[PDB]
Design a protein around this nucleic acid. Sequence first.
DNA 1: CGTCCATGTCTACTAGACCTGGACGG
Length: 265
Amino acid sequence: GEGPELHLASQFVNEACRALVFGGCVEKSSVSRNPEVPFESSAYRISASARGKELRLILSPLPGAQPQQEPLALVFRFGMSGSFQLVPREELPRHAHLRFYTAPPGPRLALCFVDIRRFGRWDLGGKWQPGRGPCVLQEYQQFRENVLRNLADKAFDRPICEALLDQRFFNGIGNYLRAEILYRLKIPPFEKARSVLEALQNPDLLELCHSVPKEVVQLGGRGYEEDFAAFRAWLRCYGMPGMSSLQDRHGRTIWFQGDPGPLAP
DNA sequence: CGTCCATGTCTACTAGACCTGGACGG
């Protein structure tokens, strides 16, 4: 679900589809309320890139494919349970909501956006969501600037643990990353955001917003039962024995150690 | 059987709503 997983999903799409050629239409499950993808091509390649908590697929017709198609872009958010899988055409997982079909010569495969709870969404248009800040993984300096330029924003009145989830400034950070980040600096989660970002204008909190998710990207994995164990072995705080936890203002669990901090409930 | 919990938004009147499924309680 978080920035590293989106990033790994987009590497997965790029690598797994490196030698695939897709054809035909793009199929959506009936249950899915996201929009139909009007795209048909006899021969196209798929590629991807990630930005924070979004992923962009590009569908690219080979030369001379028919019908006529200019490339198409789609932007995915995963919600709580999204992923991409490459599977045998007739062995679709349950909840594969959007499906791209390889073309012949070779084994009939399907690239699927798989999403159990259907919190994920896509849009037509390759446009990043307006409002999202820069990617903490891939656009670090922009990300860092955008936070420091904007400390007056009322978002920074909130505890630091809540501010870290705001995708306008922390695009890519989610519930496990906020615990892991805060925990490396032993910053109380209910310290006030502005105070912690008002005295830093030895990695600092904004640097870890980049390097911590980068560590995850570097474990590789997220199924892209063995890889989940490397991840579990990497977590130091989120869900771990001996840690405290509390409910933030929006009912989400913050894991931490020690001082809850002045704005605690 | 039931309750609770989960890597996020999204929406409409901060408190649900939107979903499925696994762990675990009786």
